[PDB]
Amino acid sequence: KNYARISCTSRYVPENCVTNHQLSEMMDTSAAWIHSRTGISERRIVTQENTSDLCHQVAKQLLEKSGKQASEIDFILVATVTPDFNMPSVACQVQGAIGATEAFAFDISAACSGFVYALSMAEKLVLSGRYQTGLVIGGETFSKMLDWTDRSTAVLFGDGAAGVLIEAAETPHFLNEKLQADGQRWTALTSGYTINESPFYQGHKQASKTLQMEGRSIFDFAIKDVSQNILSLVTDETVDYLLLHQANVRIIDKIARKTKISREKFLTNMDKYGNTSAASIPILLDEAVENGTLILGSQQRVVLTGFGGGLTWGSLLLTL
Amino acid sequence: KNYARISCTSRYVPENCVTNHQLSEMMDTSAAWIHSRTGISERRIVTQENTSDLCHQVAKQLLEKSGKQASEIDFILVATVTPDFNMPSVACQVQGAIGATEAFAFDISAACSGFVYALSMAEKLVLSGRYQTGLVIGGETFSKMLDWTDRSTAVLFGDGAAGVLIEAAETPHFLNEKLQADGQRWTALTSGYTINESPFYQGHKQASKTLQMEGRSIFDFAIKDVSQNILSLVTDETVDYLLLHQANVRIIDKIARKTKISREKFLTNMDKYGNTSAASIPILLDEAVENGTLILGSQQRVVLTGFGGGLTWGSLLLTL
Ligand SMILES: C[C@@H]1C[C@H](C)CN(c2ccc(C(=O)Nc3ccccc3C(=O)O)cc2Oc2ccccc2)C1
Ligand SMILES: C[C@@H]1C[C@H](C)CN(c2ccc(C(=O)Nc3ccccc3C(=O)O)cc2Oc2ccccc2)C1
């Protein structure tokens, strides 16, 4: 048994629900326009929780659902770009919160590709035969990284976390993968810059630290490069469902045409969550499993496709 | 060929050299006292470079040394807790800087255990058979995370980066490993907190963001837990050299006694670098290889042991 397998899914978002109506007041825009530009109706925003707290509940819920003991966890991987501290890692805060004393843990930084990247990691870890049980969680609190006056980005993001319980299976589930990156375009999407202000620094680098994005640029990138990445693993005839990063539904609309894969196969759920970055795919996954669209153990050929800052992007082809 | 192997080593530190004499003036302490408390005589501090720049030179040097093409790199892993941005990752900035268009990349957050953790990752990646050539670099610019007035921590850290070229070998090199963590003590060593100041935040969390450490606490932790972790892989009779995280030489003095492993086997090099966090082990490694203490391809049984914020710690047993 050295084949990684997603046994359980689970998600957790802040209770505070922020509708477009509240954002139209905060800012000076119309809820109607916020809705048509984003494809979002409402989103959750933390009021007292930080990334680790959201990830903590996900882990806690995964443990209760599966009936697993925190002591049976061998490793905890968290995909995030909005961690409480640089040190400790969010994965370590969760490891301590749930008491997974026998698990080692760390965070992975790959922007909105983070969950897919982390999932690829867990597969490698389990393949080695050294580890069998892990928790892979994607979580963010981007609401603390936004300029809530600029209505061309703030209205786009939601907070939340979701993950899965991974355990060693007898038969393969993770069939193929293709992880990629292009740092030659890293300026297209950035956040979290830290100014060096030691008495030794001589540069004049300044950066608000709030998210910055070249919409058209990354939109075009997704359509061209993600489409090619997806087509390197499947074709319409060999895939049942595709769970892409929930950045913008129109990206999905166009990718389905580009790749010639049936549009109803691409699941989406931005309406109530907005763009939850690394958490987008596992939140979508938990919902699709929860309502019976996706069925664990059914052998449905599913592709998970993330893409984001880096630039980063990658897909995983699995049989649920 | 699916056995990870360290083929090349390389290091890079800022040219700006800061001696204890300059720090005694800056602060109001004696160089003599800074020396006896830290075991450091001088350290490098960035004046214009950021973590990615240091890691960039390491990658660039590794590529030139080995004669490899940036296009032959399959993956780039960077261990850091002081990245330029949360997004993009430092690994992505390096991937773009050196033109490793065929490599996917991401950063790993495991504090001063980061390099060991990243190395464990690369081993898993190569084991899978999907990837053969990678660059694993540990780099930090902690000088931007310190309060240069508090002489109980600032005098401790240096800037720098170092890494290795990893490629698929025919015979095993990575013999064993034991990665661990304890998030129940994460408050003992923290840095980089990000305050949430969205119009929705109701908490009153505040944190300077500069490094905070409970010296005695983590010192005791290292002596007890790292000693046990090391003894789970070797005994004096089965190890030739041990490269531990360069946090404090006295930790090594005591660990050698605790574990009963010959003291001359633990290599150290804080004098000219200070504590370079994640970069400490690969800098030490490159130096020991450079001067002939350690010999690649000689089959010397070597243990790499990192420990740091998280809490995190772990060792790798290899035959060079
Ligand atoms: C609030 C604004 C409203 C506008 C209409 C859409 N915005 C946009 C929202 C999302 C994207 C986009 O491509 N996003 C992404 C692409 C790759 C990886 C990650 C993302 C991410 O949003 O996290 C791009 C946007 O801007 C354009 C889309 C098409 C053509 C030109 C720009 C969000
Ligand atoms: C500048 C100060 C000078 C004092 C004398 C030593 N400081 C200290 C320097 C380092 C440590 C220490 O244990 N460090 C660590 C332990 C585990 C993982 C990482 C570190 C790290 O420094 O990065 C602890 C220190 O403080 C004590 C050591 C022994 C007993 C009580 C406190 C640094």
Side-chain angles (χ1 to χ4, degrees):
Chain A
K1 292 183 180 184
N2 52 76
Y3 294 121
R5 142 153 75 62
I6 296 175
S7 301
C8 297
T9 67
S10 187
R11 70 179 187 282
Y12 178 88
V13 293
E15 175 171 52
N16 179 52
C17 179
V18 177
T19 73
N20 292 328
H21 179 58
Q22 315 177 200
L23 289 182
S24 71
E25 299 197 63
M26 258 189 64
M27 304 172 266
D28 197 46
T29 314
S30 72
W33 186 232
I34 290 181
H35 190 325
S36 57
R37 292 158 63 216
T38 66
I40 305 170
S41 287
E42 69 185 27
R43 77 287 284 148
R44 303 312 183 78
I45 303 299
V46 294
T47 57
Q48 282 153 174
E49 297 159 302
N50 204 335
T51 306
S52 64
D53 297 307
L54 303 182
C55 297
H56 170 24
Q57 295 306 304
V58 174
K60 175 184 184 182
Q61 290 167 25
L62 284 167
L63 243 43
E64 286 169 357
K65 288 183 66 166
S66 63
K68 289 281 181 172
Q69 293 284 204
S71 61
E72 313 184 72
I73 304 302
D74 295 336
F75 64 83
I76 301 178
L77 305 185
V78 172
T80 185
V81 293
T82 52
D84 303 18
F85 308 80
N86 284 295
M87 159 182 78
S89 60
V90 169
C92 280
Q93 304 186 82
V94 175
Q95 193 262 26
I98 62 175
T101 66
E102 305 315 295
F104 66 83
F106 65 93
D107 300 340
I108 287 177
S109 181
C112 290
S113 302
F115 190 66
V116 167
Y117 269 45
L119 227 42
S120 171
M121 273 316 108
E123 193 275 322
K124 275 51 177 190
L125 283 168
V126 181
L127 248 195
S128 82
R130 289 176 181 284
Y131 316 99
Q132 292 76 226
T133 308
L135 300 176
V136 179
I137 305 168
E140 314 271 19
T141 47
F142 247 112
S143 59
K144 65 188 178 186
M145 307 293 298
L146 303 166
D147 166 18
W148 293 88
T149 62
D150 166 43
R151 51 228 187 182
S152 61
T153 61
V155 298
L156 234 183
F157 305 80
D159 292 337
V164 301
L165 165 63
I166 285 193
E167 48 188 15
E170 194 180 72
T171 66
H173 283 281
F174 290 74
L175 270 29
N176 203 1
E177 79 186 17
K178 191 173 185 181
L179 305 180
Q180 298 177 251
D182 179 21
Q184 300 198 197
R185 283 182 283 177
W186 70 259
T187 66
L189 184 53
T190 73
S191 77
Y193 183 74
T194 294
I195 298 178
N196 180 357
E197 41 204 1
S198 72
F200 304 95
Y201 199 60
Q202 296 184 298
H204 298 69
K205 294 62 169 56
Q206 304 169 62
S208 59
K209 145 264 191 174
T210 68
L211 193 159
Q212 304 286 309
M213 70 181 275
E214 297 177 10
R216 182 82 238 181
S217 290
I218 60 183
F219 181 83
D220 284 346
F221 146 65
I223 307 303
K224 183 178 181 302
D225 299 315
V226 173
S227 291
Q228 266 155 37
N229 175 285
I230 291 177
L231 290 179
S232 78
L233 300 188
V234 299
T235 53
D236 193 16
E237 309 77 25
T238 67
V239 69
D240 299 312
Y241 291 99
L242 302 93
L243 310 198
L244 280 55
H245 161 53
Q246 303 299 291
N248 175 296
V249 179
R250 308 315 169 180
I251 286 178
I252 297 176
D253 277 337
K254 295 177 180 289
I255 283 186
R257 287 183 208 105
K258 187 71 167 178
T259 62
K260 297 178 190 300
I261 293 175
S262 187
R263 179 62 178 74
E264 42 267 273
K265 290 184 179 179
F266 298 76
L267 306 189
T268 62
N269 73 334
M270 288 192 83
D271 200 62
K272 315 284 184 179
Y273 301 113
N275 184 336
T276 58
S277 310
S280 81
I281 299 183
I283 282 182
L284 174 58
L285 176 62
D286 181 60
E287 268 197 346
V289 167
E290 186 193 7
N291 61 37
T293 295
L294 290 179
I295 299 172
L296 304 176
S298 67
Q299 295 190 192
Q300 289 167 142
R301 298 175 67 73
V302 181
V303 174
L304 303 179
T305 304
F307 40 94
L311 262 32
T312 60
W313 75 95
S315 298
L316 293 183
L317 169 65
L318 35 152
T319 47
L320 283 184
Chain B
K1 292 183 180 184
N2 52 76
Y3 294 121
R5 142 153 75 62
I6 296 175
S7 301
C8 297
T9 67
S10 187
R11 70 179 187 282
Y12 178 88
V13 293
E15 175 171 52
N16 179 52
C17 179
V18 177
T19 73
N20 292 328
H21 179 58
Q22 315 177 200
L23 289 182
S24 71
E25 299 197 63
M26 258 189 64
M27 304 172 266
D28 197 46
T29 314
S30 72
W33 186 232
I34 290 181
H35 190 325
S36 57
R37 292 158 63 216
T38 66
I40 305 170
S41 287
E42 69 185 27
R43 77 287 284 148
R44 303 312 183 78
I45 303 299
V46 294
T47 57
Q48 282 153 174
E49 297 159 302
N50 204 335
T51 306
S52 64
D53 297 307
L54 303 182
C55 297
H56 170 24
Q57 295 306 304
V58 174
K60 175 184 184 182
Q61 290 167 25
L62 284 167
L63 243 43
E64 286 169 357
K65 288 183 66 166
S66 63
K68 289 281 181 172
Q69 293 284 204
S71 61
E72 313 184 72
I73 304 302
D74 295 336
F75 64 83
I76 301 178
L77 305 185
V78 172
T80 185
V81 293
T82 52
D84 303 18
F85 308 80
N86 284 295
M87 159 182 78
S89 60
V90 169
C92 280
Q93 304 186 82
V94 175
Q95 193 262 26
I98 62 175
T101 66
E102 305 315 295
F104 66 83
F106 65 93
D107 300 340
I108 287 177
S109 181
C112 290
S113 302
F115 190 66
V116 167
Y117 269 45
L119 227 42
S120 171
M121 273 316 108
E123 193 275 322
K124 275 51 177 190
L125 283 168
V126 181
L127 248 195
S128 82
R130 289 176 181 284
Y131 316 99
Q132 292 76 226
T133 308
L135 300 176
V136 179
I137 305 168
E140 314 271 19
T141 47
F142 247 112
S143 59
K144 65 188 178 186
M145 307 293 298
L146 303 166
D147 166 18
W148 293 88
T149 62
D150 166 43
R151 51 228 187 182
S152 61
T153 61
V155 298
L156 234 183
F157 305 80
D159 292 336
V164 301
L165 165 63
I166 285 193
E167 48 188 15
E170 194 180 72
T171 66
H173 283 281
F174 290 74
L175 270 29
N176 203 1
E177 79 186 17
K178 191 173 185 181
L179 305 180
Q180 298 177 251
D182 179 21
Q184 300 198 197
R185 283 182 283 177
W186 70 259
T187 66
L189 184 53
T190 73
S191 77
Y193 183 74
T194 294
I195 298 178
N196 180 357
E197 41 204 1
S198 72
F200 304 95
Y201 199 60
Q202 296 184 298
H204 298 69
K205 294 62 169 56
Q206 304 169 62
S208 59
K209 145 264 191 174
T210 68
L211 193 159
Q212 304 286 309
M213 70 181 275
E214 297 177 10
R216 182 82 238 181
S217 290
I218 60 183
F219 181 83
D220 284 346
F221 146 65
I223 307 303
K224 183 178 181 302
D225 299 315
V226 173
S227 291
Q228 266 155 37
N229 175 285
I230 291 177
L231 290 179
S232 78
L233 300 188
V234 299
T235 53
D236 193 16
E237 309 77 25
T238 67
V239 69
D240 299 312
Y241 291 99
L242 302 93
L243 310 198
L244 280 55
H245 161 53
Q246 303 299 291
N248 175 296
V249 179
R250 308 315 169 180
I251 286 178
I252 297 176
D253 277 337
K254 295 177 180 289
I255 283 186
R257 287 183 208 105
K258 187 71 167 178
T259 62
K260 297 178 190 300
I261 293 175
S262 187
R263 179 62 178 74
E264 42 267 273
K265 290 184 179 179
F266 298 76
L267 306 189
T268 62
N269 73 334
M270 288 192 83
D271 200 62
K272 315 284 184 179
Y273 301 113
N275 184 336
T276 58
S277 310
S280 81
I281 299 183
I283 282 182
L284 174 58
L285 176 62
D286 181 60
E287 268 197 346
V289 167
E290 186 193 7
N291 61 37
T293 295
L294 290 179
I295 299 172
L296 304 176
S298 67
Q299 295 190 192
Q300 289 167 142
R301 298 175 67 73
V302 181
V303 174
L304 303 179
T305 304
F307 40 94
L311 262 32
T312 60
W313 75 95
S315 298
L316 293 183
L317 169 65
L318 35 152
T319 47
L320 283 184

